[PDB]
Short mmCIF file of all heavy atoms in Angstrom, two decimals:
data_model
loop_
_atom_site.label_atom_id
_atom_site.label_comp_id
_atom_site.label_asym_id
_atom_site.label_seq_id
_atom_site.Cartn_x
_atom_site.Cartn_y
_atom_site.Cartn_z
N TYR A 350 -2.14 -6.82 -27.74
CA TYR A 350 -2.02 -5.79 -28.80
C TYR A 350 -1.02 -6.30 -29.83
O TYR A 350 -0.07 -6.97 -29.45
CB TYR A 350 -1.65 -4.42 -28.23
CG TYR A 350 -2.84 -3.63 -27.75
CD1 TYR A 350 -3.26 -3.68 -26.43
CD2 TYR A 350 -3.59 -2.87 -28.63
CE1 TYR A 350 -4.37 -2.98 -25.99
CE2 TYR A 350 -4.69 -2.14 -28.21
CZ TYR A 350 -5.09 -2.20 -26.89
OH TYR A 350 -6.17 -1.49 -26.48
N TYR A 355 -0.37 1.68 -36.03
CA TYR A 355 -1.13 2.70 -35.27
C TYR A 355 -1.95 2.07 -34.14
O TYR A 355 -1.84 2.58 -33.02
CB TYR A 355 -2.02 3.55 -36.17
CG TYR A 355 -2.82 4.57 -35.39
CD1 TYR A 355 -2.19 5.64 -34.77
CD2 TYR A 355 -4.19 4.43 -35.20
CE1 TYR A 355 -2.90 6.56 -34.02
CE2 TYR A 355 -4.91 5.34 -34.46
CZ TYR A 355 -4.27 6.42 -33.89
OH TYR A 355 -4.97 7.34 -33.16
N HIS A 356 -2.75 1.04 -34.40
CA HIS A 356 -3.67 0.45 -33.40
C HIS A 356 -2.92 -0.55 -32.51
O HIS A 356 -3.29 -1.73 -32.47
CB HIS A 356 -4.90 -0.17 -34.06
CG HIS A 356 -5.84 0.85 -34.60
ND1 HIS A 356 -5.89 1.15 -35.94
CD2 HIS A 356 -6.77 1.63 -34.00
CE1 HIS A 356 -6.82 2.08 -36.14
NE2 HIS A 356 -7.37 2.38 -34.97
N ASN A 357 -1.95 -0.03 -31.76
CA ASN A 357 -0.94 -0.81 -31.01
C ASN A 357 -0.99 -0.38 -29.54
O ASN A 357 -1.82 0.47 -29.18
CB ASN A 357 0.46 -0.62 -31.57
CG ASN A 357 0.84 0.83 -31.75
OD1 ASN A 357 0.56 1.67 -30.90
ND2 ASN A 357 1.48 1.14 -32.87
N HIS A 360 -0.87 3.31 -28.69
CA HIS A 360 -2.22 3.92 -28.86
C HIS A 360 -3.07 3.69 -27.60
O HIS A 360 -3.70 4.66 -27.10
CB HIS A 360 -2.88 3.37 -30.12
CG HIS A 360 -4.30 3.83 -30.26
ND1 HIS A 360 -4.63 5.16 -30.41
CD2 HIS A 360 -5.45 3.14 -30.30
CE1 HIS A 360 -5.94 5.26 -30.55
NE2 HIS A 360 -6.47 4.04 -30.47
N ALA A 361 -3.08 2.46 -27.08
CA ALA A 361 -3.89 2.10 -25.89
C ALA A 361 -3.49 3.01 -24.73
O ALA A 361 -4.40 3.55 -24.04
CB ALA A 361 -3.71 0.65 -25.53
N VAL A 364 -4.45 6.71 -25.31
CA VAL A 364 -5.92 6.96 -25.17
C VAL A 364 -6.26 6.98 -23.68
O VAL A 364 -7.06 7.85 -23.28
CB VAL A 364 -6.74 5.93 -25.97
CG1 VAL A 364 -8.22 5.92 -25.59
CG2 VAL A 364 -6.59 6.16 -27.47
N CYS A 391 -10.20 2.26 -21.68
CA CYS A 391 -9.30 2.95 -22.63
C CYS A 391 -8.10 2.06 -22.95
O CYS A 391 -7.78 1.91 -24.13
CB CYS A 391 -8.87 4.30 -22.07
SG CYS A 391 -10.18 5.54 -22.26
N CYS A 393 -8.01 -1.07 -22.98
CA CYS A 393 -8.47 -2.32 -23.63
C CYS A 393 -9.22 -2.06 -24.94
O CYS A 393 -9.56 -3.05 -25.59
CB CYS A 393 -9.36 -3.12 -22.70
SG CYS A 393 -8.43 -3.77 -21.29
N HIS A 394 -9.44 -0.80 -25.33
CA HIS A 394 -10.51 -0.44 -26.30
C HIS A 394 -10.18 -0.95 -27.71
O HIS A 394 -11.11 -1.03 -28.52
CB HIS A 394 -10.79 1.06 -26.27
CG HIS A 394 -9.83 1.83 -27.09
ND1 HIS A 394 -8.57 2.13 -26.65
CD2 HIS A 394 -9.94 2.35 -28.33
CE1 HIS A 394 -7.93 2.82 -27.58
NE2 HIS A 394 -8.75 2.97 -28.62
N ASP A 395 -8.92 -1.25 -28.02
CA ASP A 395 -8.49 -1.76 -29.35
C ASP A 395 -7.75 -3.11 -29.23
O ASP A 395 -6.98 -3.44 -30.14
CB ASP A 395 -7.63 -0.73 -30.08
CG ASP A 395 -8.40 0.31 -30.90
OD1 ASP A 395 -9.50 0.01 -31.39
OD2 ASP A 395 -7.85 1.40 -31.07
N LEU A 396 -8.03 -3.90 -28.19
CA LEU A 396 -7.37 -5.22 -27.95
C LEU A 396 -7.48 -6.10 -29.21
O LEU A 396 -8.59 -6.27 -29.71
CB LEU A 396 -8.04 -5.91 -26.76
CG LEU A 396 -7.32 -5.74 -25.43
CD1 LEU A 396 -8.18 -6.26 -24.29
CD2 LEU A 396 -5.97 -6.44 -25.46
N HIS A 398 -6.48 -5.67 -32.26
CA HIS A 398 -6.75 -4.96 -33.53
C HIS A 398 -5.76 -5.46 -34.59
O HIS A 398 -4.57 -5.62 -34.26
CB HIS A 398 -6.62 -3.45 -33.35
CG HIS A 398 -7.43 -2.69 -34.33
ND1 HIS A 398 -7.10 -2.64 -35.66
CD2 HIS A 398 -8.55 -1.95 -34.18
CE1 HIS A 398 -7.99 -1.90 -36.30
NE2 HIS A 398 -8.90 -1.46 -35.41
N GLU A 423 -15.16 -3.65 -32.30
CA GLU A 423 -15.41 -3.13 -30.93
C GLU A 423 -16.02 -4.24 -30.05
O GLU A 423 -15.60 -4.39 -28.89
CB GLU A 423 -16.25 -1.86 -31.04
CG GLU A 423 -15.53 -0.70 -31.72
CD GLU A 423 -15.44 -0.70 -33.24
OE1 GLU A 423 -16.25 -1.40 -33.91
OE2 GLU A 423 -14.55 -0.01 -33.78
N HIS A 426 -13.10 -6.38 -29.22
CA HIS A 426 -12.25 -5.73 -28.18
C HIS A 426 -12.85 -6.00 -26.80
O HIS A 426 -12.10 -6.36 -25.88
CB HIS A 426 -12.09 -4.23 -28.42
CG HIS A 426 -11.54 -3.86 -29.76
ND1 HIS A 426 -10.52 -4.57 -30.34
CD2 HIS A 426 -11.84 -2.85 -30.60
CE1 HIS A 426 -10.24 -4.03 -31.51
NE2 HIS A 426 -11.03 -2.97 -31.69
N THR A 464 -16.40 3.61 -29.08
CA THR A 464 -15.20 3.94 -29.90
C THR A 464 -15.43 3.56 -31.37
O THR A 464 -14.56 3.87 -32.17
CB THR A 464 -13.90 3.34 -29.35
OG1 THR A 464 -13.93 1.91 -29.39
CG2 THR A 464 -13.63 3.78 -27.93
N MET A 501 -15.01 8.96 -24.81
CA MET A 501 -14.28 7.82 -25.44
C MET A 501 -13.85 8.22 -26.85
O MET A 501 -12.67 7.99 -27.18
CB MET A 501 -15.12 6.54 -25.47
CG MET A 501 -15.31 5.93 -24.09
SD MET A 501 -13.73 5.49 -23.28
CE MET A 501 -13.14 4.20 -24.38
N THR A 502 -14.72 8.86 -27.63
CA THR A 502 -14.37 9.36 -28.97
C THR A 502 -13.23 10.38 -28.85
O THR A 502 -12.25 10.25 -29.61
CB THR A 502 -15.59 9.95 -29.69
OG1 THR A 502 -16.66 8.99 -29.77
CG2 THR A 502 -15.23 10.41 -31.08
N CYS A 504 -10.97 10.86 -26.47
CA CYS A 504 -9.70 10.19 -26.08
C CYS A 504 -9.16 9.41 -27.28
O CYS A 504 -7.96 9.52 -27.59
CB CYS A 504 -9.93 9.27 -24.88
SG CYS A 504 -10.41 10.20 -23.40
N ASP A 505 -10.02 8.69 -27.98
CA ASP A 505 -9.59 7.83 -29.12
C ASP A 505 -8.97 8.67 -30.24
O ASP A 505 -8.06 8.14 -30.94
CB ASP A 505 -10.76 7.01 -29.64
CG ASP A 505 -10.31 5.81 -30.44
OD1 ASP A 505 -9.12 5.41 -30.31
OD2 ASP A 505 -11.16 5.26 -31.15
N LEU A 506 -9.43 9.91 -30.44
CA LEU A 506 -8.98 10.79 -31.55
C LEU A 506 -7.85 11.72 -31.10
O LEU A 506 -7.47 12.56 -31.92
CB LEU A 506 -10.16 11.63 -32.08
CG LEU A 506 -11.31 10.86 -32.71
CD1 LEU A 506 -12.33 11.82 -33.30
CD2 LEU A 506 -10.83 9.90 -33.78
ZN1 ZN B 160 -8.52 3.37 -30.74
#
Side-chain angles (χ1 to χ4, degrees):
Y350 275 93
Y355 179 68
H356 288 102
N357 50 42
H360 173 63
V364 165
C391 282
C393 292
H394 83 281
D395 273 331
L396 263 170
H398 206 290
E423 294 79 21
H426 304 319
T464 65
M501 289 301 295
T502 304
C504 296
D505 200 19
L506 296 185

